[PDB]
Amino acid sequence: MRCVGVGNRDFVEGLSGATWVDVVLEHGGCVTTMAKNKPTLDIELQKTEATQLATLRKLCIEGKITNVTTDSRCPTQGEAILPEEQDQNYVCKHTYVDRGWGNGCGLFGKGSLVTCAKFQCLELIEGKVVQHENLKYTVIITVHTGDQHQVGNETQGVTAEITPQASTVEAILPEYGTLGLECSPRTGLDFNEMILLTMKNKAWMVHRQWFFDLPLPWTSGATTETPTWNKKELLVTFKNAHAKKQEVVVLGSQEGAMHTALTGATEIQTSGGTSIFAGHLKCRLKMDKLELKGMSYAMCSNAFVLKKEVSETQHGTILIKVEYKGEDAPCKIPFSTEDGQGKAHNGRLITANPVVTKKEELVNIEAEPPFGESNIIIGIGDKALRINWYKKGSSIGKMFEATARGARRMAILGDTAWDFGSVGGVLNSLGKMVHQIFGSAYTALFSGVSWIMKIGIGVLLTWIGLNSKNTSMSFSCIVIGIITLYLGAVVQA
Amino acid sequence: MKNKAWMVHRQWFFDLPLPWTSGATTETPTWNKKELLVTFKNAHAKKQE
Amino acid sequence: TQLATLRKLCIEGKITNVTTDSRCPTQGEAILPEEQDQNYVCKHTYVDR
Amino acid sequence: TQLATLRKLCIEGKITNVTTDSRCPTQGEAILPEEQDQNYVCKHTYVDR
Amino acid sequence: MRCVGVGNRDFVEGLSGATWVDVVLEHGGCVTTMAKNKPTLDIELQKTEATQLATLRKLCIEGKITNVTTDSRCPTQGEAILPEEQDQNYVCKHTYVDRGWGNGCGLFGKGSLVTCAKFQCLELIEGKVVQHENLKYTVIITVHTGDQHQVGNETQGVTAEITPQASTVEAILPEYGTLGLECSPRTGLDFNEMILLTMKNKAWMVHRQWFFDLPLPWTSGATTETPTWNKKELLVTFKNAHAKKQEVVVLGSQEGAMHTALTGATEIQTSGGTSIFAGHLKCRLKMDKLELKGMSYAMCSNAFVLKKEVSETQHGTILIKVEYKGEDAPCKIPFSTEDGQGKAHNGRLITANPVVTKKEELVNIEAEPPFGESNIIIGIGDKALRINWYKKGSSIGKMFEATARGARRMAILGDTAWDFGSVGGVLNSLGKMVHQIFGSAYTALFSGVSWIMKIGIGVLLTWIGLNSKNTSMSFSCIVIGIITLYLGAVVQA
Amino acid sequence: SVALAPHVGMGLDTRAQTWMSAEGAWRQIEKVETWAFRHPGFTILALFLAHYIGTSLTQKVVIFILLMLVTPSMT
Amino acid sequence: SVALAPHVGMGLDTRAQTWMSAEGAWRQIEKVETWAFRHPGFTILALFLAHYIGTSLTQKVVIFILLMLVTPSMT
Amino acid sequence: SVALAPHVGMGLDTRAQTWMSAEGAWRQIEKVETWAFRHPGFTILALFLAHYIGTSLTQKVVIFILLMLVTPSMT
Amino acid sequence: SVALAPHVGMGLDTRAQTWMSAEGAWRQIEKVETWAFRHPGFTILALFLAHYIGTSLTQKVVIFILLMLVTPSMT
Amino acid sequence: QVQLVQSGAEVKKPGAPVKVSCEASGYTFTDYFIHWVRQAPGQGLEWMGWINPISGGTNYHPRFHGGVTMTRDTSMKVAYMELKRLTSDDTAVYFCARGRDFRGGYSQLDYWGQGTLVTVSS
Ligand SMILES: *[C@@H]1O[C@H](CO)[C@@H](O[C@@H]2O[C@H](CO)[C@@H](O[C@@H]3O[C@H](CO)[C@@H](O)[C@H](O)[C@@H]3O)[C@H](O)[C@H]2NC(C)=O)[C@H](O)[C@H]1NC(C)=O
Ligand SMILES: *[C@@H]1O[C@H](CO)[C@@H](O[C@@H]2O[C@H](CO)[C@@H](O)[C@H](O)[C@H]2NC(C)=O)[C@H](O)[C@H]1NC(C)=O
Ligand SMILES: *[C@@H]1O[C@H](CO)[C@@H](O[C@@H]2O[C@H](CO)[C@@H](O)[C@H](O)[C@H]2NC(C)=O)[C@H](O)[C@H]1NC(C)=O
Ligand SMILES: *[C@@H]1O[C@H](CO)[C@@H](O[C@@H]2O[C@H](CO)[C@@H](O)[C@H](O)[C@H]2NC(C)=O)[C@H](O)[C@H]1NC(C)=O
Ligand SMILES: *[C@@H]1O[C@H](CO)[C@@H](O[C@@H]2O[C@H](CO)[C@@H](O)[C@H](O)[C@H]2NC(C)=O)[C@H](O)[C@H]1NC(C)=O
C-alpha cells in the first residue's frame, strides 16, 4: 500500500526475461519493483484470512469439581472400587490409607482407597486447524504514481485475492495496465502443520505437534453438548494428606500458565472472521502489460516550487514534494540529478514517470541520490528549482546493510528467501538447492533449541573448531558455529 | 491464595515474578513491578498494543 | 492466633486508560505525563514514522 | 525561525509538602496515599524501631 | 534503657585496676558499660554545640555584572587602559580586536580593548571556624534502672557538659552515685582543620584546605560595607565575538554546583545554634564512686507476670517487661537461667540489679541469653514465671560480627579506635602506638583517594603483591591491598 | 514465569504430603522425555558434542546427559 | 505443567513479533540467576564436580556451566 | 564551587550519613559508563594504545583501564 | 551532576569562539595540579605503583602520568 | 495578618546619613525578599534593591550600589536600610515590599510598607 519509510521495503529491480520477476511478499514490509520503462510498484501482502475453520481438538483451562465419592477396603482385601470409575465424566486415583478399629476395619494395616469426583471445564481453549485451501491472500498493489497524498498512505492501492483455487490473478491497475500475478499460496507457512488455537478472544498460530503435547485435558472437538474429557488427572490434584484420608481439589485456571507457554508463538487476529497476519507469500510478478501514464505527454516549460522539505528514508532514498506552477496541466517533470562538482547523472528516479496531473495538485517524486553531496534539478531552463542534498554513508555501508538484510531474510524465510528478487537464474537455483539440503539438515539438528542454548551450542562449536587439528573438521565447525550464533541472535523475531 | 493457604519458605515468596504491594491494608494499593503481568507487543514495529 | 500480612502479590489484572505518545526519529524519547503515576505501567518502544 | 521547543529541563526546584509514614519490622513496606501521585518524588528507607 | 534497640550500641565490660574504663563516644550509637558490681548504664554523645564562630572568608555563589564600560586603542599602540582597572569593585580583561578604517583607526591591525565590569555578587557562602576554646559537648548518661516506659527513651537522662575548659566532670546519677567523666575533647575531632560553611539555611563541615581551594571569589570576613572581592573572574566570562568586540556575561548561581561539590561532607545544623552532629570524642569513665540500687534489698517473694511480649533486640538481648504481683514493694528480683535441664547460667544479665521500686509500676529487664535454647526464671518457687528463648546464631558468627564491627570502628576512627574498651592495657597501648605509626604513614599516602580509586588501587596493589618474588614485601603489599579494599568498601558512610 | 521456579529443594520438609508431590515429582522428567521424543534430531548433536569433548567415557556420558537435560529445560 | 514447555525453538518464524518475545527471551536466564544467587552454596559443589571430572580446562568449564544451568531448571 | 572537585577524599569521616552519599558514590562511574557508551571508538583506540605499550597482560590491562577512566573524566 | 560531563570534544567546532573557552580550556589542568599539590603523598604512591608495574621507562612514565591524572578526576 | 510598617517620616540635611527601617511580622521573614522601592515626589516609581533575609545577600540597583546599604537583622524581623551620604537630589519616599524567592516572584510585590518619606533641605 505504497509504504515509504516502513524500514523494510526491500527494493527489487530487474527482470529475467519475458518481463517477470520472482518476489516473496511478507507481512512486515513491502517490495518495490522498478524496471526500465515500467511503472514502479510498492507491492506487499496485506492480510491472509481463513474463511472457514475446522475445530480439531479443544483443551480446557478452568475446571469445576462436584459429586466427590469415596470407597475403601481393609488392607488385605485389595483394591477399592467405585461404580463411577467407568464413567468418563469422573476423574479419580487410587491411594493407600491406614485402617483399623477406629476406622471400622477389623484388621490393621494399609488399605486401598479410591475417591472419584465429577469433572467439567468452565472455559476451554479450542484449537482449530485451518484447511489449506480455504485461505485468502490479499495482496495490495499500489501504483506509485506520484500523487499528493500517498507518501506513506496505507489506504490507497489495488486489492487482489490470492487463493489456491485461483492463484493466478491479473490485477487491473487504473490507467497503468494489468499486472500479472502468478502466485504460490500453497507453499506459505505450511498451514497443514499448524493448529491456530483461540484461547478466549485471543488466538495464536501454534505448530501442530506442540498443541498435541500440552498437559491439559482435551476433547474430540466435535461440538457435542456433553464432552468427554481425556486425561482429566492433569487438572484435579489428589492429596493423600497424612495417609489417613484423600481429598481432591481443582488446580485452578490455567490461563496464565498457558499464556506463558505461548511465548515465541506468533499472535493472530481473531476479531470477526479470523485474519492471519505474520505470513509470507511467494507471488511472482509478471509485468508484461504495465504501461506508463504520461509517456504521451510533453515536458513542462515552467518552474517548480518545494512545498515540504526533502527527507531521507531509512534506505537512503530521498522524497521530493513539488508543485508545478504552469498552465499545461498534463505534462512530465524533467528530473536530472547533478552530482557534486560534476553534471554526471548518477542519481536515478524511483518514480517511473514523474507526472503532474493538475495545476493545483501536488506531486511526490521519489529518487535515490548518490552517496555524496548531490544537487537535484526538478525544472527546465535556468529558473529550474535545484534541490541540494547530502546523503550520508558509503557504498560499503549499503553493501554491509544489504548483506545483513539478506542474512535476516534467509533467517526468517529459509530456502524461500533465495527466490526473493530472483530473476530466473541458474546459479541462483543451484544455490537454492544446496541451501535447501543444508537447511533441512540444520533444522533437523537444531529444532526446539532456545534463544540462549543456540548461542551456547554455537560458541561450543566454534571453540571445538578452533581447537580441531583436522582442517576440514575445524573449518566446518567454525563455519557452522558462526551461523548458529547468528541464528541464535536473530531467532524469535 | 484464595481460601487455600500454604506454608512457603520466606525467601521464595520474595522471588515470585508477580507484582507486589506493601500489604498495608490500604484502600488504593501501589503495585510494584507491574511489567510482569502486562505484555507490550510492538506488532510490526509500527504501533504498540 | 493472629497473622500479620507482610506482602501481597496479585494474580489477575485488569487494564484500562491506555494512552500513547510518539516522537519523530531524531527528536528523542517520548513522554507521557502519566509515567510518574505509580498506578500506570508502560514501556518505551521504537516505531517507524 | 519557527523553533519547536521540546524537553523542558528543570535547573531549580521546590518541595512544598513533605509527608512521612513508617511501619514496624515484618509489617511490610510503608506506603503513602501520595505515592501514586505524579507530582511527588520519594524513596524507601529502612529505620530501626 | 535510653539506648536499647538503637542499632549501633556496642557493649563495654570490664574495668581497670582503679575501676575506670575509657571509651570513644560517637554520635551514631551509644556505649552500654557494665561491670562486675556496677550498674549498667547507657552513655551516648548528643551534640557539640559550638558557639562564638568567627567568619574567615566569604565565597560568593552568584554575581551581577553592572556598568559595562570599555575602551579600545588603535593598533600598533599600547594596550588599552581604563580607570576602572585600578578600582577593586571592577573586573576587567584585555583582548585583541581587529581595527580598520571602518572602526576609525588610521592603520589596520589588531587593536587592544578592555571591558571593565563592576562586580556585585548577590548570594554568598560564609565559612566559619570554631576554636577549641569554645567547643562544647553534651553527654547523656542513663543507668537503665528497671523502669516503666524507659526503653529507648531519648528524653530521659542526666546530661553532663564537657568542654575543653574543665573537661573532667562528675555526673550525679540520682540514685546510683556519681559517674566521673575524665575526658579529652582535644583529640575528639579536628575542628582546627575544619570550616563551617553556611549556605542559605544549611551548612556543612568541610576540610579547611578544601574550602580555601574552591574556585569561587572570596573576601575576608570583617562585616564591612561594600566588600572588595578577589578572583572575580571565576563568575565572569568574557567572549570575543570573531575578534571584533567582546561582551561581559556573569555565569550565574553556583548553588547546584556547590551542592554537588559538597558530596562527602557531613551536614550540620544552623537553626537554634551551630549544634554540630556527626562528631566523636573519647571519655575515660571513672566508675569508682558508683553504687548499685540497694544490693541489700530483700529478695522478692511473690511471682511476677508478663505485660508485654518478650522481644529480642538486634544484638540478641531479650527484653522482659514484668509486673510484680506482691505487697512488699522494695525488693530485688530473683533472676536465673537454665539450658537443657541444666543450670548452666551461661546467660548473662545486662541490667545489673533488677529491683522493683514501687510494686505498682511494672518493671522491665534486659538480659542476654545463651546461644542455645534457654529457660529464664524470674521467681523463687513454682510460681516463678518461666521464659524460654531460642537465640538463633553461633558463637563463631558472633565473633565474626564483633570483628566486623571492630574493623568498621577502626575505619571511622583511626589511631584512637584502640581506646574504645581499653582498660589501659600494655598490649593495647603497644597496638595503639604501632597502629598510630602505620595509619599515619598510610593516610599520608592515600589522602584524597576517592571511593572507587581506593578499590582500584587496592586490587592493583594486591595483584602486585601476588607477583613479587621478594616475599618480605609480597606479604606487606597483599596486607595493604586487603586493608585498602576494606576501606574502599567502607568509606562514604 | 511463576511456574518456572517451583518451591522444591527448600529446607521445609515435614511428614504431610506436600502440595502436588505425586504430580510434581515427575513433571520435569516427563517434559524432558516429551521434548526428546519430539526432537530426535538433537540427540545426535548432543552425542557429537559429548564425543568431541569427553576424553574418557565417563566424561562423555556426563556431558551427554547434561546436554540432554539442559536444552529442553531451557526451552 | 503447561508453562514448562514454551513454544520456542519451533520452525515457525516470521517477521512479526512473537507473543511475549521480549519478556520470554530472558525469563530462563533470569530464573537461573535468581536461583544461583539464592543458593550460593551449590556453586562450590558444581565447581567440585566439574574439577574432579574435567581433565582439561575446557571440559571443566563445560561441565561447570552445564551443572549451573541444569539444576535450577530441573527445580 | 565547581563540581569537578567534590569533598570526597578528605580523611574526615564519621558514623553519620554524609551529604549526597548515595548519589555521589556512583555518580562518577555512571558518567564514565555513559561516556563510554556514547563514544565507542575510543575503546578501539585505547585497545590499540594498551596493546602497543603493554608487554605483559597486567601492563596492558592496567593501561587500558586507566586510559578508559581518564578520557571520560578528564574531559 | 551535569557539570561533570562538559560539552567538550563534540564535533561542532566553528570559527566563532565557544562559550567559556578560556576558562574551560584549563579548568581540568588546574584541578589536577591543585589536587596533586594538596595531596603530595599520592605522588609517592603513584611513583611506587609505576615503578613496580612499569618494566621500561616509557611504560613507567605513562603509568605514573595516568595515575596522577585519573585520581584527581575520579575524586 | 501580615503587613510591613516603616520607621516613620524623617528629615535630614544634605550630607547626613539616614537609616530608614521596615518592620516585618505575621509571616516567615526568611522566606521572602524586601524590595525597598523608591518614589520621588510626583515622579515615576523606581526600584532600588532587595535583600534575602534568609542569607543576607543584597542585590542593589546599579545606580544605588555603594551609595546605599541594607541589613536584614533577622533577629527582630526588621529589614533596615541606610543611605551613606544623603544628597539634596535624593528626596523621596522609600517603600519596603515583599517579594517571592523564585524568578516568577522576583518582580511581584505585595504588602508594601507605607513608606518613610525623607526630605532633604538646608
Ligand atoms: C552604573 O550604571 C547606572 C545606570 O545603569 C548608573 O546610574 C546612574 O546614576 C546617576 C547618578 O547621578 C544618575 O544621574 C542622575 O539622573 C537623574 C535622572 O532624573 C538626574 O535627575 C540626576 O540629577 C542625576 O543626573 C543616572 O540617571 C543613573 N542612570 C540610570 C538611572 O540609568 C550608575 O551611576 C553607574 N555607575 C557608575 C557610573 O559608577
Ligand atoms: C451430585 O451433587 C448434586 C448436588 O451437589 C446432586 O444434586 C441433587 O439432585 C437432586 C435431584 O436431582 C436434588 O433433590 C438434590 O437437592 C440435589 N442436591 C443438592 C442440590 O445439594 C446430585 O444428585 C449428585 N449426583 C449426581 C449423579 O449428580
Ligand atoms: C490517503 O488517501 C485518501 C484517499 O486518496 C485521502 O483521503 C482524501 O483526503 C483529501 C484531503 O485530505 C480529501 O479531499 C479527499 O476527499 C479524500 N478522499 C477520500 C476520503 O476518498 C487521505 O487524506 C490520504 N491520507 C491519509 C493520511 O489517509
Ligand atoms: C479512563 O477511562 C474511563 C472509561 O474508560 C474514563 O471514564 C470517564 O469518566 C467521565 C467522568 O469521570 C465520564 O463522563 C465518561 O463517560 C467516562 N468514560 C467512559 C464511561 O467511557 C476516565 O475519564 C479515563 N481516565 C481516567 C484518568 O480515569
Ligand atoms: C500542602 O501544603 C499546602 C500549604 O503549604 C496546603 O495548602 C492548604 O490548602 C488549604 C485549602 O486547600 C488551605 O485552607 C490551607 O491554609 C493551606 N495550607 C497552608 C499552610 O496555608 C496543602 O493542603 C498541602 N497538601 C497538599 C496535598 O497540597
Side-chain angles (χ1 to χ4, degrees), chain A residues 160-171:
Chain A
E161 268 83 16
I162 300 310
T163 61
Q165 284 74 357
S167 79
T168 296
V169 168
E170 277 215 341

Side-chain angles (χ1 to χ4, degrees), chain E residues 26 194 204 206-207 210 214-216 257-265 267 278 408 412 448 451-452 460 463 492-493, chain H residues 1-3 5-21 24-29 58 62 66 69:
Chain E
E26 286 167 340
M194 278 181 151
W204 292 269
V206 305
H207 193 199
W210 177 87
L214 283 199
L216 275 183
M258 186 63 204
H259 280 174
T260 303
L262 285 161
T263 60
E267 201 175 329
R408 182 104 50 176
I412 301 303
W451 159 84
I452 185 68
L460 191 48
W463 193 267
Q492 292 300 319
Chain H
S1 72
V2 192
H7 183 284
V8 304
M10 305 303 115
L12 277 301
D13 47 12
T14 185
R15 295 288 187 191
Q17 186 64 255
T18 49
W19 164 267
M20 295 178 70
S21 160
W26 293 93
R27 149 179 297 131
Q28 200 70 22
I29 310 189
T58 304
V62 69
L66 263 57
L69 261 52

